[PDB]
């Protein structure tokens, strides 16, 4: 399969104006400065831009590009987006299970995971972890190689590479770039956009397309690239690199004058002659959930640097709160002391789950790459990570928390009340995290994603029945009490706590008491807060919290589905 | 003045082992890969490394290097550390006032601010703001030029440049690098370490010193640099750049073998022959405070993007708190409602001043550069920014705040009580900011500087007399209540608030009342919290808060003074 393209007009201002060229099933290249359409022409051929501003036609071996061209052709993006906290054997296994297991069996597809493991040369680092900025692993020259084989699993006719030697320590650059020539003998069309090649790959170019400032300068093979400028008016004599010279006419030793002789050159008049002649998901849903979770669950425990940091800070906080209110009694300072701690637990769960914004913003460029390549639907990436990084990461600081703080305090020695506290602590922890998930998904920078959290969760802990006595704010702004997660947690934690206690030893304030403004018995404390004493008045909050989850979850699912991924 | 150095042995592993060379009062260069001692040799000649691991002698024109060599010789660091939110006319004025005004007058030194303004060519952008990532200004080619003239004010014999063309859009690279040759005609010795020169400056090198992997490869002028390798065993024929070839022997088309012929070459045997022959603050304190503040105060209002963002979020928070507790009455919900708001004000000041960690961590590399160059003492940089970015930035969210929230609430309609609230709100705001200043000064990354804040200020708002009733925690951990800023704010805000109110209409609970556990009169509310009713018991907190400032300020002054600035 060969690629070709004609009269490509791309507008955002036209960033890619008058570009036409033909590829070969060999090893091609897109050179030039990065300010022009160098990166832009590669995404056009990869169908990675949006097709709105495009005008021309990318004709693949005479056929027009179908909609499943993107699932047939890999695209190694610039930065290493491989899963760093996994092993390269499993890292090739992740893509292999998401694009092949429809009709072939398991051990059938096990062949091509090993068949590609020595053509890359990855057998010496096959069973090692990759390597991140938080951990050490395989060297950086083979972080790029496992990116290449990851899209080599599905059988490619075309293979793009966005700048595959940016930050790769050029002593290691030749072996991967010789390896792309070795793949090209079988028929794999390779169209990369290398960044400042010195000389070593420049002898091994089957074609090249230099592009600068949105104007097509030169397209032709590298052996006849030297013989262009020496009869075109631009002398590159000895002690001058040829791959470095070609951009010096743009540097000024005119912005369109460097390319207008290419219209009247001996390349474009016959390249058009071919172009004027040539112009005449896949895997099941339960399997897609089973693999994005298994990748994410292995990524969770594989880097337990911040996951278990949340565990040990939940243990010692529940020990400190346990040491402070150790054996809190039913004296005068019962309502002041046990409504205080229940305020702290719900607002901490509201505030410790600001870290959930760092969920869809680390792997955002990974998700944009893996959705558009066809690994999974958005409904699989979204649901798969909630079962992996949201359920067994917010459930833990509610049952590790409440087993320590409850009996060390002596709140209410029942068996359901220990459970309707553990349930409502994980109900605010799922609700507040999914709220922080909502207004931070589909974003790249967590500057405003944390700025919009920390000034909004203080617009909620005000309206939470401790600092305010909610039934005393006048009604024209007291409607805001319903739009606040910690009110439902605090009230549900108060309703199962102040129901049998009387904070008043030496008397009884059940039915007969003079000298009011007392609040001796516990239910009178709740009616001053306006919390309903009915048993529905506990579970009124949870069905308001469960609706708070699902409302705030589907806006997060929308923001990933309605995200511009081009 | 000419520089020279002999047998330079630098250990951290020896990063700079056997390097010796001579400079010329011309234009020198330090080439090679960045992994070796390329950047390391420049800091040695600039006396920018620490002199601990150094063994050899940097001999300047036969004299040894004095301790005031660093104030005599500029050093343009790699990144642009000029003040971006100032005008280049004032940007040259800042250095001019800090190193010249001891004996000459003001308008005398005004000559050399203009005398250097056209040799750089900065007259067209003299009265414009420089340019940052938050604002636009002068182009990036002249951001580097104002860095050069900023150390040209004091009369230099020697002038270093750490990589002066890293990210400078090489079409603009020649004019600044031709300008360094134009400065070299007067006698200014220029020793830079340029990064990958292509050819254009390579013809204009008065000397060069290539260095790779801590082993001295070649030192000699560029005209006799070509004639080295063609009789040394390494052929660089036509269509090969000479400045790019010299590192290909390290790339492998042996780590010490490339330099051992330089020991038996026709350069080192006579360079040693000179070396074996040659081996035979300033400005007043009130003026230094007056200029670092004027720079910082102009940097504050010159970029009012986040400064006035704190103002408008203080106004609308004080309006929202004003709208919530609008006219709070003396009913049963008086203690629940007005001790709640006073908890919120002190903890917000404790928590809104987490942004004070972004004070000595933005200009840290600026401070390291400007202290070591001799602009000011550490006591001037530290005190100058407190009078600029700490006084009129935390005073504003305590008098803009308390004028709105006080009379809209109706707290206590005195005239001192409005002031002993405004005083104690700015006492926590200065204390908590200076605590956040303390454990974040002298650091580069605000990851742990915010991580150690947000988990410590919740170890303080627990012990603040609202969630806990401090006199009920057993004494073996209740000693922790003194190590907490918001307890002193909340208590001082409570002591001036609960002193005449009785929250109990229809009765009086002054001296005669049955049916206790009432808390009807306001002073009985304070004695349950253990807050002393004596008038010293208000100001007990402020003299504990003023000692909290000075203790937490001098650890910040220590961390800048005892900071490794090499
Ligand atoms: O925990 C709180 C918090 C709280 O427990 C009770 C009241 C609070 O106001 C907070 C809180 O504010 C908080 C964080 N916010 C800092 C910015 N607040 C500025 C308000 O204008 C930022 C982070 C944060 N918690 C991180 C705790 N780490 C896990 C241990 O539970 C908090
Ligand atoms: C997208 C965002 C802004 C929507 C906010 C979600 C909140 C405000 C919505 C979603 C579900 C709603 C709740 C669902 C049903 C109940 C139970 C009823 O007995 C009291 C009201 C209450 C509790 C509703 C209040 C408003 C509510 C909590
Ligand atoms: C470096 C850090 C850890 C030191 C912490 C500072 C705090 C804990 C120190 C510094 C100054 C000290 C205060 C100064 C004097 C008083 C007034 C006295 O009537 C009560 C104790 C009290 C209030 C001290 C308590 C402890 C104190 C507040």
mmCIF file of C-alpha atoms in Angstrom, chain A residues 241-354:
data_model
loop_
_atom_site.group_PDB
_atom_site.id
_atom_site.type_symbol
_atom_site.label_atom_id
_atom_site.label_comp_id
_atom_site.label_asym_id
_atom_site.label_seq_id
_atom_site.Cartn_x
_atom_site.Cartn_y
_atom_site.Cartn_z
ATOM 1 C CA UNK A 241 25.835 19.909 6.290
ATOM 2 C CA UNK A 242 23.252 19.232 3.549
ATOM 3 C CA UNK A 243 20.402 18.425 5.948
ATOM 4 C CA UNK A 244 21.192 21.638 7.829
ATOM 5 C CA UNK A 245 21.654 23.822 4.735
ATOM 6 C CA UNK A 246 18.135 23.430 3.333
ATOM 7 C CA UNK A 247 16.575 25.601 6.057
ATOM 8 C CA UNK A 248 19.160 28.408 5.814
ATOM 9 C CA UNK A 249 17.308 30.005 2.896
ATOM 10 C CA UNK A 250 14.395 30.548 5.286
ATOM 11 C CA UNK A 251 16.786 31.918 7.935
ATOM 12 C CA UNK A 252 18.128 34.425 5.410
ATOM 13 C CA UNK A 253 21.623 32.960 4.848
ATOM 14 C CA UNK A 254 11.299 35.884 0.063
ATOM 15 C CA UNK A 255 9.010 33.819 2.306
ATOM 16 C CA UNK A 256 7.349 32.328 -0.794
ATOM 17 C CA UNK A 257 10.267 32.862 -3.217
ATOM 18 C CA UNK A 258 12.185 29.799 -2.015
ATOM 19 C CA UNK A 259 9.407 27.499 -3.276
ATOM 20 C CA UNK A 260 8.235 29.170 -6.496
ATOM 21 C CA UNK A 261 11.105 27.650 -8.482
ATOM 22 C CA UNK A 262 9.848 24.251 -7.288
ATOM 23 C CA UNK A 263 6.722 24.944 -9.353
ATOM 24 C CA UNK A 264 8.986 25.363 -12.398
ATOM 25 C CA UNK A 265 11.348 22.562 -11.389
ATOM 26 C CA UNK A 266 11.826 19.090 -12.840
ATOM 27 C CA UNK A 267 9.997 17.349 -9.973
ATOM 28 C CA UNK A 268 6.534 18.895 -9.633
ATOM 29 C CA UNK A 269 5.627 18.689 -13.334
ATOM 30 C CA UNK A 270 5.838 14.880 -13.280
ATOM 31 C CA UNK A 271 4.666 14.345 -9.696
ATOM 32 C CA UNK A 272 1.385 15.946 -10.798
ATOM 33 C CA UNK A 273 1.449 13.556 -13.783
ATOM 34 C CA UNK A 274 0.939 10.626 -11.438
ATOM 35 C CA UNK A 275 -1.539 12.663 -9.382
ATOM 36 C CA UNK A 276 -3.516 13.652 -12.483
ATOM 37 C CA UNK A 277 -3.492 9.950 -13.462
ATOM 38 C CA UNK A 278 -4.381 8.548 -10.018
ATOM 39 C CA UNK A 279 -7.279 10.986 -9.589
ATOM 40 C CA UNK A 280 -8.987 9.501 -12.655
ATOM 41 C CA UNK A 281 -15.967 -1.450 18.168
ATOM 42 C CA UNK A 282 -14.221 -4.709 17.275
ATOM 43 C CA UNK A 283 -14.010 -6.316 20.728
ATOM 44 C CA UNK A 284 -16.679 -7.084 23.313
ATOM 45 C CA UNK A 285 -17.679 -4.700 26.080
ATOM 46 C CA UNK A 286 -16.979 -7.045 28.993
ATOM 47 C CA UNK A 287 -13.576 -7.722 27.449
ATOM 48 C CA UNK A 288 -12.834 -4.034 26.957
ATOM 49 C CA UNK A 289 -13.697 -3.329 30.592
ATOM 50 C CA UNK A 290 -11.617 -6.301 31.739
ATOM 51 C CA UNK A 291 -8.429 -4.993 30.163
ATOM 52 C CA UNK A 292 -8.487 -1.243 30.771
ATOM 53 C CA UNK A 293 -9.143 -1.999 34.437
ATOM 54 C CA UNK A 294 -6.370 -4.616 34.590
ATOM 55 C CA UNK A 295 -3.987 -2.070 33.085
ATOM 56 C CA UNK A 296 -5.165 0.611 35.502
ATOM 57 C CA UNK A 297 -5.233 -1.664 38.551
ATOM 58 C CA UNK A 298 -1.686 -2.787 37.780
ATOM 59 C CA UNK A 299 -0.733 0.866 37.330
ATOM 60 C CA UNK A 300 -2.214 1.626 40.744
ATOM 61 C CA UNK A 301 -0.320 -0.962 42.792
ATOM 62 C CA UNK A 302 2.705 -0.935 40.482
ATOM 63 C CA UNK A 303 3.502 2.609 41.630
ATOM 64 C CA UNK A 304 2.413 2.579 45.285
ATOM 65 C CA UNK A 305 4.109 5.869 46.123
ATOM 66 C CA UNK A 306 1.040 8.084 46.456
ATOM 67 C CA UNK A 307 -1.631 5.402 46.877
ATOM 68 C CA UNK A 308 -0.221 4.071 50.153
ATOM 69 C CA UNK A 309 0.673 7.625 51.119
ATOM 70 C CA UNK A 310 -3.070 8.216 51.301
ATOM 71 C CA UNK A 311 -3.442 5.054 53.383
ATOM 72 C CA UNK A 312 -0.906 5.997 56.045
ATOM 73 C CA UNK A 313 -2.298 9.523 56.289
ATOM 74 C CA UNK A 314 -5.749 8.044 56.805
ATOM 75 C CA UNK A 315 -4.475 5.751 59.554
ATOM 76 C CA UNK A 316 -2.622 8.386 61.546
ATOM 77 C CA UNK A 317 -5.410 10.928 61.109
ATOM 78 C CA UNK A 318 -7.929 8.422 62.431
ATOM 79 C CA UNK A 319 -5.486 7.723 65.237
ATOM 80 C CA UNK A 320 -5.037 11.421 66.020
ATOM 81 C CA UNK A 321 -8.796 12.029 65.951
ATOM 82 C CA UNK A 322 -9.026 8.839 67.976
ATOM 83 C CA UNK A 323 -6.505 10.158 70.470
ATOM 84 C CA UNK A 324 -8.183 13.561 70.744
ATOM 85 C CA UNK A 325 -11.796 12.529 71.296
ATOM 86 C CA UNK A 326 -10.850 9.367 73.178
ATOM 87 C CA UNK A 327 -13.915 8.336 75.130
ATOM 88 C CA UNK A 328 -16.047 11.413 74.690
ATOM 89 C CA UNK A 329 -18.728 11.525 77.335
ATOM 90 C CA UNK A 330 -22.350 12.657 77.606
ATOM 91 C CA UNK A 331 -21.609 15.811 79.605
ATOM 92 C CA UNK A 332 -22.380 19.427 78.705
ATOM 93 C CA UNK A 333 -19.691 19.251 76.020
ATOM 94 C CA UNK A 334 -21.234 16.401 74.128
ATOM 95 C CA UNK A 335 -22.956 18.307 71.362
ATOM 96 C CA UNK A 336 -20.005 20.663 71.052
ATOM 97 C CA UNK A 337 -17.589 17.744 70.902
ATOM 98 C CA UNK A 338 -19.233 15.025 68.832
ATOM 99 C CA UNK A 339 -20.887 17.229 66.270
ATOM 100 C CA UNK A 340 -17.445 18.705 65.780
ATOM 101 C CA UNK A 341 -15.742 15.445 64.848
ATOM 102 C CA UNK A 342 -18.544 14.449 62.468
ATOM 103 C CA UNK A 343 -18.090 17.785 60.762
ATOM 104 C CA UNK A 344 -14.407 17.031 60.371
ATOM 105 C CA UNK A 345 -14.861 13.579 58.849
ATOM 106 C CA UNK A 346 -17.244 14.631 56.086
ATOM 107 C CA UNK A 347 -15.323 17.748 55.145
ATOM 108 C CA UNK A 348 -12.039 15.850 55.103
ATOM 109 C CA UNK A 349 -13.550 13.323 52.693
ATOM 110 C CA UNK A 350 -14.798 16.317 50.739
ATOM 111 C CA UNK A 351 -11.308 17.812 50.795
ATOM 112 C CA UNK A 352 -9.027 14.773 50.609
ATOM 113 C CA UNK A 353 -10.720 13.859 47.331
ATOM 114 C CA UNK A 354 -9.380 16.928 45.585
#
